Amino acid sequence: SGFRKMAFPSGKVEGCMVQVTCGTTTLNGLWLDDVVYCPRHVICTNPNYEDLLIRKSNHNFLVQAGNVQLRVIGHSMQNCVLKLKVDTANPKTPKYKFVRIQPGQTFSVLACYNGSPSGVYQCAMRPNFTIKGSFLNGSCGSVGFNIDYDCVSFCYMHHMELPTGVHAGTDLEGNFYGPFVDRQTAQAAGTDTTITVNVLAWLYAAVINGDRWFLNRFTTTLNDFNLVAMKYNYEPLTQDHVDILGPLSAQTGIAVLDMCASLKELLQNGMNGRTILGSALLEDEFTPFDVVRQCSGVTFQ
Amino acid sequence: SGFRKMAFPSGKVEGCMVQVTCGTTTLNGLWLDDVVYCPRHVICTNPNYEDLLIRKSNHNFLVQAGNVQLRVIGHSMQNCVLKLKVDTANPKTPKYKFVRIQPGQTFSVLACYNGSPSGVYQCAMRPNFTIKGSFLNGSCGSVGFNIDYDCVSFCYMHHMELPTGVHAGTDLEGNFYGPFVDRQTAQAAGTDTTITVNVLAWLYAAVINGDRWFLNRFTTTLNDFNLVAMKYNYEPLTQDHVDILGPLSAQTGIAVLDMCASLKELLQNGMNGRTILGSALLEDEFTPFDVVRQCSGVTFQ
Ligand SMILES: *CC(=O)N(CCC(N)=O)NC(=O)[C@H](CC1CCCCC1)NC(=O)[C@@H](NC(=O)OCc1ccccc1)[C@@H](C)OC(C)(C)C
Numbered sequence: 001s002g003f004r005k006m007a008f009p010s011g012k013v014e015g016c017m018v019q020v021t022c023g024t025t026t027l028n029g030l031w032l033d034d035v036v037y038c039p040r041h042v043i044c045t046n047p048n049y050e051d052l053l054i055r056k057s058n059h060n061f062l063v064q065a066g067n068v069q070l071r072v073i074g075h076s077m078q079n080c081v082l083k084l085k086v087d088t089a090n091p092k093t094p095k096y097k098f099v100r101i102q103p104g105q106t107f108s109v110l111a112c113y114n115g116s117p118s119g120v121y122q123c124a125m126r127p128n129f130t131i132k133g134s135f136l137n138g139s140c141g142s143v144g145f146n147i148d149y150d151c152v153s154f155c156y157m158h159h160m161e162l163p164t165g166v167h168a169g170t171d172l173e174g175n176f177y178g179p180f181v182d183r184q185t186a187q188a189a190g191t192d193t194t195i196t197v198n199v200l201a202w203l204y205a206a207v208i209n210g211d212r213w214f215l216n217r218f219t220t221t222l223n224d225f226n227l228v229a230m231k232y233n234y235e236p237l238t239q240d241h242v243d244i245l246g247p248l249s250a251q252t253g254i255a256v257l258d259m260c261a262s263l264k265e266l267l268q269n270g271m272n273g274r275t276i277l278g279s280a281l282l283e284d285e286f287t288p289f290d291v292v293r294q295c296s297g298v299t300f301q
Numbered sequence: 302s303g304f305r306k307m308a309f310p311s312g313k314v315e316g317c318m319v320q321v322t323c324g325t326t327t328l329n330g331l332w333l334d335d336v337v338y339c340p341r342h343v344i345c346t347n348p349n350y351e352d353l354l355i356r357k358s359n360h361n362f363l364v365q366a367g368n369v370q371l372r373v374i375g376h377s378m379q380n381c382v383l384k385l386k387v388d389t390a391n392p393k394t395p396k397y398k399f400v401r402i403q404p405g406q407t408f409s410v411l412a413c414y415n416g417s418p419s420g421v422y423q424c425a426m427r428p429n430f431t432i433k434g435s436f437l438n439g440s441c442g443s444v445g446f447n448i449d450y451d452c453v454s455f456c457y458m459h460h461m462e463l464p465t466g467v468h469a470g471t472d473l474e475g476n477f478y479g480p481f482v483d484r485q486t487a488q489a490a491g492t493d494t495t496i497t498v499n500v501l502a503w504l505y506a507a508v509i510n511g512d513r514w515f516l517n518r519f520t521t522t523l524n525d526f527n528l529v530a531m532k533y534n535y536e537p538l539t540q541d542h543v544d545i546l547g548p549l550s551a552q553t554g555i556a557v558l559d560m561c562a563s564l565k566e567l568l569q570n571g572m573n574g575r576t577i578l579g580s581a582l583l584e585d586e587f588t589p590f591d592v593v594r595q596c597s598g599v600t601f602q
C-alpha cells in the first residue's frame with residue numbers, strides 16, 4: 001500500500017541527454033540514433049528562424065555527449081525543434097516513439113542542465129496546455145516521457161517559462177502545446193481548470209488503499225454532476241471518461257456516478273480538516289492508468 | 302521556478318537490480334561488483350535464520366539479471382541482509398557507498414518487482430523510522446538512495462509493510478531502521494512527529510519561488526518556538542538545525558527565527574484556505590539540502 005507521485009525509471013532517457021552549444025547559448029538535446037533533437041532557439045541572435053538557420057554551418061553546433069565530442073553532419077528545422085544529424089548513432093538508444101499527448105495526461109520529466117540529468121518528477125499537461133514543472137535557466141531541451149514495457153514514448157520538450165511560473169514546450173516534433181510561440185514576447189497561460197476524471201481516479205486510489213471517509217450513500221446523474229463541476233472550475237466529465245474509470249469502478253465496487261456523488265459533496269463541503277492520501281487538496285495529476293499501474297504492480301523493461 | 306517532489310535520476314541503480322529466487326520466494330536484489338545484496342527472509346521456511354541458512358547450498362539461490370543466469374559461488378548473512386557472491390562482476394556498477402541515514406533525511410526509492418524497476422519517488426525517513434512508501438507484494442529488496450555527483454549512496458532496502466500501511470526496512474548492511482525485526486509477529490510504528498527543520502526549509506523554498514503571504518513582522522526565541530512546536534507534535538528545533546538553515550536564511554534575507562515566527566502563526570491559525578507551493582498542508586519531506594539543490598540547479602553524473 002501507499003500512494004506516491006511516482007515517475008518512470010529514468011535510465012533509458014538519461015542515456016540520451018547531451019549538451020548542445022552554439023554561439024553563446026548552451027542547452028540540452030536528445031540523442032536518438034544519429035539525430036540530436038533540441039529547441040530551435042539555440043540558433044544565434046521577433047527572430048525569423050528560417051532566416052537565422054540558413055546562416056549557420058554544421059561546425060557552429062557543438063554537441064557534447066559525456067566527455068565525447070559529437071560531429072554535426074547535417075541539420076534541419078522541424079517546427080520549433082532543430083534536428084542535428086551527427087556522425088555517430090547513440091549506442092544507448094532505447095526503443096522509442098514520439099507521441100503528442102492530450103491535456104489531462106501525465107508524464108515524467110527528467111530535468112537536465114548542460115546535458116546532465118538533475119532530477120525526475122511526475123507532471124500533467126494542464127487543460128490550458130502548460131505544465132507546472134520545476135525548471136531553471138538551462139533546462140530547455142529537457143524532455144518528458146512515458147514508458148510502456150520497454151518503449152519510451154517521448155511527449156514533451158521544455159522551451160520556456162511563463163510569467164506565472166508555469167512552463168510551456170513542444171512535442172518532440174516541435175509543435176507547441178497550447179497557443180505559445182518561441183519568442184520573448186508577452187504571453188500568458190489561459191485560465192486553467194481541474195482535471196475531473198483524474199480527481200475521480202485518485203479517489204478510487206484512496207479507496208483501494210483503505211480510505212473511505214468521503215464516500216456517501218448519494219448518487220448523481222452525469223448531467224447533474226457536470227452542473228456542480230462547472231461551478232467549481234472542474235472540467236466536464238464525459239462518458240468516455242466514465243468508461244475509462246470502468247476498471248477502477250469494478251475493482252472497488254463503487255459505481256462511477258456514485259463516486260461522482262462523493263466528489264460533489266467534497267466540492268460543496270470542503271474537506272473539513274481531513275486528508276485523502278496525505279493531501280488536503282483534491283489531487284488531479286494521477287490518470288486512471290496511473291492509479292492502476294501503482295495499485296497493481298505493473299513494471300517496465 | 303516551480304517546486305516538485307523530485308527524485309534523483311535512477312539509471313545508475315536500475316543497472317543493479319536483479320531477481321533473487323530460492324524455494325518459492327522471489328524478491329529483488331542489488332548487484333554491485335560480484336555481490337548480490339537481498340533481504341535474508343528469502344531463506345526457505347519465529348524463524349532462526351542462522352539455522353535456516355546453514356541448511357542451504359549455493360545452487361538453491363537463483364539469481365536472474367535480465368535474461369542472464371548468475372551463478373552463486375558463496376553466501377553469508379550480515380544482520381538482516383544476505384550477501385550472495387556471484388561469479389560475474391556487474392559491469393554497470395556505479396561508484397557507490399553504503400550509508401545509514403538519520404531521521405529527517407530524504408532519499409529516492411526505485412520500486413522493483415521481479416528485479417524490474419517500476420517507478421521512482423522521493424521519501425523521507427520519518428522520526429519513528431518508518432517511511433511512507435508505495436509498495437506491493439514483491440517489492441522487498443527495492444532500495445533507496447541519494448546521488449552525489451557520480452556516487453550512489455545507498456541508504457535503504459525495503460523489507461516489510463506494517464499494519465498502518467507504512468514501511469520498514471534496513472540500511473544496506475542489514476540493520477533495521479527503528480525497533481523492527483524481520484518476523485511476522487505483531488509490530489507497530491511508534492508515534493510519528495513532523496520534521497520541523499524540513500518544514501522551515503520548504504517555507505524558504507516558497508519564498509525563493511515568490512510566495513510570501515505567510516511571513517510576518519513577528520519573531521521568536523528558539524525556546525519559545527519549541528514550546529509551540531511540541532504542542533503541535535513537531536520535532537524540537539535545535540541550533541544545528543538553525544545553522545543548517547543558514548544558507549537559505551542568507552539567500553532570502555529572512556532570519557531563521559523570523560521564519561520560525563511565521564511557522565508558529567501558521568500552526569496556530571491554520572492556513573485559512575490558502576496554499577503554499579501547491580500544498581494545503583505544511584510539507585516536511587524536503588531537507589534544506591533538497592531545497593538548495595532544486596532551487597539552484599545542482600546536477601549529478
Ligand atoms: C532555455 C531555458 O532554460 N528556458 C527555460 C527557463 C525556465 N526557467 O524554465 N527557456 C528560456 O529561458 C527561454 C529562452 C527564450 C529564447 C528566445 C526564444 C524563446 C525562449 N525564455 C523564457 O523561458 C522566458 N519566458 C518568456 O520570455 O516568456 C514570454 C514573455 C516575454 C515577456 C513577457 C512575458 C512573457 C523566461 C526565462 O522569462 C521570464 C521573465 C518569464 C522568467
Ligand SMILES: *CC(=O)N(CCC(N)=O)NC(=O)[C@H](CC1CCCCC1)NC(=O)[C@@H](NC(=O)OCc1ccccc1)[C@@H](C)OC(C)(C)C
Pocket residue numbers: 001328342436437438439440441460461462463464468482483484485486487488489
Ligand atoms: C517481500 C515484500 O514484498 N514485502 C513488502 C510488502 C509491502 N507491501 O511492502 N515484504 C513482505 O511481504 C513481508 C514478508 C515477511 C517474510 C517473513 C519475515 C518478515 C517479512 N511481510 C510483510 O511485510 C507483512 N508485514 C508484517 O508481517 O508485519 C509484522 C506483523 C505481523 C502480524 C501483525 C502485525 C504486524 C505484510 C505483508 O503483512 C501485512 C498484513 C501487514 C500487510
